[model samples]
Structure formats: structure tokens, C-alpha cells
Target: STGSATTTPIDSLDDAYITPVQIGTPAQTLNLDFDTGSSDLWVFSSETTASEVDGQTIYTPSKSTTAKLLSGATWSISYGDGSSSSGDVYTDTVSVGGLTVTGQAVESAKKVSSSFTEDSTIDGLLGLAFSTLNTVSPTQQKTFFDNAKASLDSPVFTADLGYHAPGTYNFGFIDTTAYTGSITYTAVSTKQGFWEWTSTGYAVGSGTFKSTSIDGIADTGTTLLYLPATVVSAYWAQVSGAKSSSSVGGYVFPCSATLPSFTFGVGSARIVIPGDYIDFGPISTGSSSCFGGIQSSAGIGINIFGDVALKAAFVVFNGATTPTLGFASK
Candidate 1:
């Protein structure tokens, strides 16, 4: 069976996106961050310390008749943003959109980092990365998508993230009307437990395309687009007053300066990220500098095509016999 859900960005800058998920028999609806970059369907729950709880919703398994403890099973996970959460495991009925999965592992957070506590926009995260990255102990568990794949018409899911607007996450099927032109398919490497693939090349603004292979992952969890240092430098060079600042952390430019669009290739197709999307937003209220959405992946080790790139196209994550990725301009 196929299911579809609308995912909304948490803020105007699209720092992260969240979707509604029903957990437990009573269907406690919690808005969760659908992260394609990590694996671990963890949540803030009754098990979490009261001090760690802010304005975020908590999942109370005791309220559900279908909840069952996974004896001795525990989990913990951390993110690149320095946020983390840890807790015990419970198997309960979980639903996304209308698709249901019985006995789904729901990691209940007993402890959470300060970063997570401050962000009340998400109650938890519904992981979409490969199950191999799951943090459950004693025995790792499959992701919600992996568990529901058998019931899907096709073992696939698609992400249509948006820029300052709500988008969609479709399970089991692709909507033909959601995209333009033809979809381009590419081989993906699951070795790192990520939807990692090599991009054909890139072009800054209306410049010529460079035929270099850049390895990266399609991570909806991350906020910006990170490429090789050389490529990032090239893009910034075109901006009148862009600078890689030590205090600002990454690249920041004059808010008044006109930014250039970034285009990256997937096979013979190219996806263009508009300049406005790259402007992110002003560093602070009434600030003259704006943080750039495209930065060097040098510190990150691996290049990341995060929300900034994902919002530019319709992305398909195929978990078929041979894993592949599909991209289409929307």
C-alpha cells in the first residue's frame, strides 16, 4: 500500500522539516523530523527526564494497549549538529500518513542533549536512512520504511522538500504530476549506510559545467548544501562581498549582494538551486551579513546535498533489489 504525507518546514529558513506521525494504539500524533541522513526512530517520551522536556510532545507508551517493551534493548544516537538522544526501546503500532506498521521499534528518549531540548519544533525524528545505521542494541531494528517495504507496491519512497513552504513525502509510489521533464536514475552506495552517490559535476550560475565526480549523500536532515572546498570557493568568488569567516563559522556574505544559483548534475540532468534559497537568511535581526547555504564540506569529510539541494528536485530513494536513486526537476 502507498501513503502520502505533507511535511512542513519548521521555520522560514527551512532549518528542518517535520511530518505528523501516529504512534501507539490510541494514535498519539507527534510531529517528527523525517531524517534521511540518520537511522534511529527515536522520540521524546514519558521515559525522558522531566528536566529535558521543553515544549516538545512526549510519546507515552503506557497509554497504548499495543505497546510492548523490547527487553534489554537500548539505543543512543548523535547528529552532526551536536544534538543527541538516548533511551530504551519499545515495539508499538506506528503509522505514517495512512500506512501502518505493527510492532515498530520506537526508541523512547530517557536523556537528550541541550540542542534537542531547545528545539521544540520536533518531538522526535523518523529515520529514513538505511537500517544498518540503526542504534538499537542486542539486535538492530529496521527503519519504518524498511519494515513497511514489503507492503509497498514498490520498495521506494520519495522526498519533495520545499523552500519556505510545505512539501511532501510519498511512500511506495511516485506521483507523475509532481515533477517536470524525465527522471534520471543513478547508482547509490549503501556502504556508509547513507544514500550516497556521485554527482556528475556542477556549474555556478550560468557558467560552464565542470565534469568532476563529487561523492555525497541526499540528506534531508541537514540544512545546507556542502560541496568540495574548491567548488564552494568558486561559487563565493562570483559574489561581490562573500567571505569565509572564522567567527561566523562558514561562508557569509553581504545581505544586499546578489547571490548566484548553483546547479549540479545527476547523469545528464542538472538541478538548479535558486540564489534566494542559498541566501539562508540574515545572520541576526537587521544584520548586514547573511549566512550562505552552500559551504565547503572539507570539515565534514563527506559532501552533503542537504535540504537546499533536495528542495530543488523530486528525489526518489529506491530500496529495491539493487538500490538506486532518481532525481527529477520539479
Candidate 2:
């Protein structure tokens, strides 16, 4: 078949709730977000206090057909942004999108803050990104890829974003039509799970800017593409009459007068960012202009290439085959 093989569909018992996957068997179940940004499987449990559990989805092993707890394996994780959570260990069967994976390692938090607790819609997060961010420490690490690799003919996994609607995230195979004829594969540096790379340069309208290359990372968890101030200013100069304005929580601009196409180069591959993603909202006060691409990040080292930059491309997190990522188009 020209298209890749699809996974079996699992039924979501209650429409209000997504299907519960068995972690190891009928013993444990974890609710996950299947996030594409980070790679780890964690859930909130009943041991957590009501304050810590507010708005968070808790796993009740007792309600399942089979459940087991890991006597004393405690876990906690903190992010770069200072956000943190901690919990104990549990064992169970985990299922998702109709695929059942057993004997999986899951984290159960006993303490959480309002930031994490406020997201009640999702039971937990299933990081489908790369393995570098897995919190299990090398000695005890076991990612979803580690367990699901054996079930597939090929070790590749694909993230099929739902766009504005509920979308499907697929593992094991990829849809090749997402790109031109060839795809670009980059070897992931051993730093961490962050997929950081240097862009040779960028383009605005019909002219090219040879500014100093910038280090960047692709983050599906983020919503916008953050660029360096130099790059942003250089780009704004190209679009005639385009001026920076303030909108939302950050600086935005309107450039309907000179909206130009932009492309980013990673090695030999050049990926295009569409204009609509940039003009989604107002850029600044008094100016009704919307941004087309390029924005100033108040001095953050890691510039995030968010979902807007990833919409047209098919991303493959190949932890199974190699510590690398493959980008293709459909």
C-alpha cells in the first residue's frame, strides 16, 4: 500500500474519557496525552492530596481488573522553567490508540502544583518525542519506544497532528507523501531529548539574509516559533511597511502590505513556514497588522520551532533505529 499501515483502534469506554491502556497487563493503566515534545510516561494517583490533585487526572489502580504498586520507587521531575512534580512508582498494563503495551514503567505523582493540576482534561502525558528527556535515569530507563519496538515491522514512528481538531498520533510507521521526493534525516546530538540544530540562514520575500547562524530546537509542545532579535529585525526590514506592535502577551505586527514567504535551511533541506500561521492574531496595539513569521523572544537561548513550523511536515522520532530524527512531507 502507498500509505503506511495503521494501528488497531481501541474503544474509549466512556466518551467523556479516553481509553485506558494496560501498562503491563490488566494490572496497571495510565492515562496519557501522547505528547510529541517530551518522552516520558507519567500519571497522577490517589496518594496525591486534593490540592495537588486539583484539575489533574488520577489513576485509580483499584478500579482496574489488575493493578500493582512498586513498593518504594519514588520519582520526581523538574523542568527548565522551574515547574516540578513528584510521585511514587506503580506497575500496570497501558494501552493507546488500540495498541496494548505491557510491563511498562509509569510515574505516579503524590505532590503537584496548580500549574500541572489545572489541566484536568488529560489523565497524564505520554511523551512520544525522543528518549533524551526520559526521566527514568539510564539504569532504570524504559520508554514507550523501548516496549513498542518489537511489535512493529519497522522501528520508525510518526506524529499525525490533528490540526484544529482531535488528531491521531501514530507510532511504528510513517506516511511518506508528507514531503517532496526526498526527506532529510538529522543525527540527534547526545545533549538531551531537545532536538537542537543550527539553521544555515533564513529567507524573506525574495532576498536572502546571511546573518550568523542560530541554534534552534523543534518543540511540538510549544505553540510558536521563537527567533532571535537580530533575525526578527532583519526579517521585518524585508516586508515593506511592516512594523512591530504589541498583541496577546508579546510583540506582534501587521504586514499585509508586504507579507513575504520565508524558508529555513537545515543542512540541505529547506522547510517553508506558511503565512497564515504567522497572522493568526494581532501583532501590536493601534496597528491591526498580523505577523507573517519571525518574532522577538525576550532573550531565551532555546528558540522553539513550534507546531506552526511543523504543520506541513511529517516528523519521525527514531529512537528504535538510531538516536536521530527524520523529517518528511505528506
Candidate 3:
């Protein structure tokens, strides 16, 4: 295991980082979102009706002689955000950076939810999540990272998700230059198909750090950190004009409102997210309401440390052994 792959961010639709990769023998390329929240290498494909495809570059297996159909196996997946896609399976050669994986399972979408159809910039998802989270039916499939791990320098991948800036999804190797300071680590709980960890606690805007416990998932697919209702209320309470709004679906503060940076813990190490990042941009044009990037994670069961929190650190999705998550300032 000694190969590596690096990805650049697309910055479309707020906060997803996209990567380019070649699939199949002829090497068809596609820009896909590298998501750690799910485990399915799915793509918008020829099977999708022309109307549902939008502007996405679809993958065609017939063009690749090396492509093989995985009989009776199909896949359907729905995201926590209500987005979905479904299709049958194919096995093909997939490559990223200079590394290649043969016989990798590729799920070609025949149908995609409206969200995916509208976001045509990203054609598919190259899941970095655990293989056990794969959604293929009849027989399960492995994720791109999992299939390529055995051949990698180390079973590890790092996420450098910058705010509207280009970042790389480094695979099989951990490049220390991407981050600053010591990499703080904590054991990860993957029982629920995610990189779940317990943050020792949190604090708002230069306030004293609290030593409580927050169990959450480091989901690159999500754009914000979602905490408990009580904690959400406390953080926004510090913003003079901020208030929770049902219409906006989160706390909204005046555009001019100033907020303090927030700090959280991983063991005794501290990582702080700037207030500007917590604003998640304005709620709408010509409106004073700016939606909060952090909110209550009540519905999702687990709190989510999304891109808003992730961009503050260079995250290591350490799949090497017990799978600990390492965080360092970036």
C-alpha cells in the first residue's frame, strides 16, 4: 500500500469538495463528491432517463470492455437530507491520482432525487466511508477506499476541507504538511455507519471551554455542525440579534451581527471554528437574516461535525486498525 490520490474542491452549492477520477478501461473521467458519510461509489449513468440526468457527465459501462455486470445486485440509498439514488451494479477498473483498483463495484444510478438532479456539477459520490456502510443489495460491495486500502501505504485518508478553497482528499498516506500543530486523536465509534466520536465538550466565542460530552459524526457530506437543542440555544444566545426561525430552518442573525469563534475538544486538544464560518453565508439576498451554520441535531439522533467544523482542522479518517479520527489545526 504505497499509492496516493489528492482531490480539489469544487465549491458549488456551498460546501462539497469534488475530485476527478478515471473509471473503466478506456478511462472515462468524472468529477465526483468525496463523501465520508456513505459507502457507495454511485454515478449518474446511461441508465438514468435523459430528463433526470441534467448537466452531469454520465458513465457508460458498455464503452469499457473491462466492465462486468454484477448479476442480481442492485442498490438504492437515501441520505439523511432526503436525497436519494438507486441503480444496478457493475464491476470495473477505477483509478484516482496514480492508484488503480480493479474489479471495483460501481453503482450506476437509474434514478436520482431532485437535489442530485439539480446539482449537476458533481456527477457521482466516491464514498470514503467504511465498506460495511455500502448499500448494494443481494450481495454487499466495498467502498473505493476499502478496496484500495490493502494496496495503500497505510489504511488512512485525510480530509483538508477548506472554505470555498481547494483542498485535497489524500489517500493511503498522511501528509503532515497539510496541517499545523500536533494531530490530536480519539477513538472512533463506527457502529452507526459513520465516523462517530465523542468531543470532550465545547464553548462559544472565546468563552470558557466546557468539559461535557458530545457524540457526533464527522460528515463531510454535511455543511454544518448540528448539536443538541440546548447547546444550539446557548451558542446563538451570545449573538445579540440571533434567533431561531422556522421559516429559515435555523437561527438567523442580522447580517451585521458579530459572533465569537467557537471552541471544542478532542481529548484535551482544542479546535476553534471562526464565527464567519458559522454564519454559513447570508440566508438570502436583500435580507438581514443570515442563517446559522450550526443547529440542533435532534432529528438526526447524532450530532454532526460537518464541513463547518471540519474546515477548521485537517482531519484524518484513520481506517488503520481500530479507526481513530485525528484532528490538527490547518
Candidate 4:
């Protein structure tokens, strides 16, 4: 069956993270975050003020004759962290891995803060989550996936998250050899701009918690898996030696123990997230140094399946053929 164009969240609010993608050429390597929630591919520019271009890898349009600018139109984006940036619209022959899509839409931010300018590892963001959150206009319109779709051999794209490792994210084609069984396909809902889905419930350790079904959007823009407070508390309760300490963002746990495997029911498909994936970066607060990952969002009304859960499976997003998302063993 063909994949759907309808948007759907990869997981409930608690398991989503921005997918990392490669850009530019072999020499000027620019690793970007892929956010389906928005529709802009922005990168720091070399012409930008030195203060704004700090740790970012700015793309020099002068270096490529294929670059073109959209005059009179400007762009700006604000994050939940109160960080924002603005710039102009530009087009160029952008290449992602082996795929080269010409006239690819991109953003050149003029004003950027230390979070963006000082991040040595992250250069910029490439949005592929959904078009509903796109910032590009009608007159000057183009998306990274929109252009690259025509060049791909298949009508599908897969996200292979690295997890503890840096991980490899591929587009255009999925390495089915990495998977074990036939893929499960879910219909996409066209009404929601973000990829929306219904998760029956979740399981922690050997006990399953049956609560109201979760309804939310899947986003690569977010980092941590944001979930309801009740669900978050129940999950940690099952983890051996897991504690709720104020020091480590409230959900601190000992990294020495092996975390229990958790699974969520998506219709008939049971998606599993291994224990190692549950542990996250270290939280430094006062005299406490503990594990980070699960946290309380109170009432965010959304649950995300960030990178932690996504890295363990092979995700296929179908926009060219149908509005469906296909999942398979990775």
C-alpha cells in the first residue's frame, strides 16, 4: 500500500526529539535538525555579523552560483525557550547525502543568539515533520522534501536514530535489511496539520497502565518526551531504584541499574523502547548529578515520541504516495 500524506505523530508526547540530518557537501559538513513541525531550512550565513555567526557553520552563497534569493520577503522563528532568529529566503542546489535537489528552499538568519550561534555541533534546522507549521509563503514556496522527492528512487523516507551513538539518518530509501518483519502501516489523518495518532496505552516493567488514549502531534522540534504527570510518575515507579528527586529535574535515577523495557500499543502494533533509551543526559543542580529523560509536563495536552523511542525502530514517512506512516523492525 502507498504511504499517506496526512500528518501523524511518531509517538505520544513523551518520546520525540528533533531528527538530525546532513547537508551541504562532503567538505562543508553541516548537520541540521529535521523538524516536521515547521517548513523552513535555516542555516547561519558566513556574511552574518561575527557575533551572530559564532559557532554556527554559515553557508556562503557566493561560493555557489546556483544560489538565488527571494527579495522583499523576510523570515523569523521563535522557540519555546524564548530564542528567536530572523533572516531572508534563499534557494540553492542543496544536497542531502547522495540526493541532490536543486532549487531547494532555505533560510539565511541574520540575528541569532548563543544557543544557535554557539552550538558547535548543531549548524541549523531542516524542517520535514509537516507543512502545517511551515513559515514559507505562497509566492516563494519550496521545501526540502518537496524538491528531493522527485530525485528519490522510492516514494518513502526513513529515520534511523543512533540512540547512544551519533546514529545515521537516511532519506529517500529505507534499509529494509535492517528490519526483521513486514512493515505495519497506519492511515494518516488529513484534518490535523501535525502527524496525529491514537495510542491505546503504555506498559512499564510488567504492569500496564490503561488510561485515556493519547492524542497529540509528533515533532522533531522538541527534545524530551513530554507526557502527562500521572503517566510519568507511574513509569518511574516501575524502574528499579528510580527516584523523584528535586535535583535532577524531578525524574532522576541511578544509571547503574538496567531500566525496564517499556512498550506502547498503537492499534495492533506494539512499539517497544528498550531500557537504555530511557536514560538521558546528566542534570547538574546544586550537589545532585543524576540521569535525565523522563520528566513531568503537567498538562501540555501533547505527548511526543522523541529520538529516544524513534532510534530503536525504522520509521517510514510517506508524503508522495499516501498519508500513512510505516513502521518496521530496525
The lDDT leader among the candidates is 1
Worst 10-residue lDDT window for candidate 4 reads 1-10
Best by TM-score: 1
Off by over 4 Å in 3: 1-6
Q: Model 3, poorest ten-residue lDDT window?
A: 4-13
Model 2, 245-286: lDDT tens digits are: 553544445544535566766666766665554554444445
Cα miss at 190, model 2 (Å)? 2.5
Two-way TM-score contest, 2 vs 3, winner: 3
Task: Write down the TM-score of every candidate.
Answer: 0.99, 0.75, 0.96, 0.83
lDDT of each: 0.94, 0.59, 0.87, 0.63
Of the two candidates 1 and 2, the one with more favorable lDDT, higher being better, is 1
Task: Count clashing pairs, candidate 1.
Answer: 0
Which TM-score value belongs to model 1? 0.99
From the highest TM-score down, the ranking of the candidates is 1, 3, 4, 2
Tens digits of per-residue lDDT for model 3 on 179-293? Answer: 8889999999878878989999999987888899999988888888899998888899999999988888878888898877888899999999998888766787678788888
Residue 261 miss distance in model 2 (angstroms): 4.3
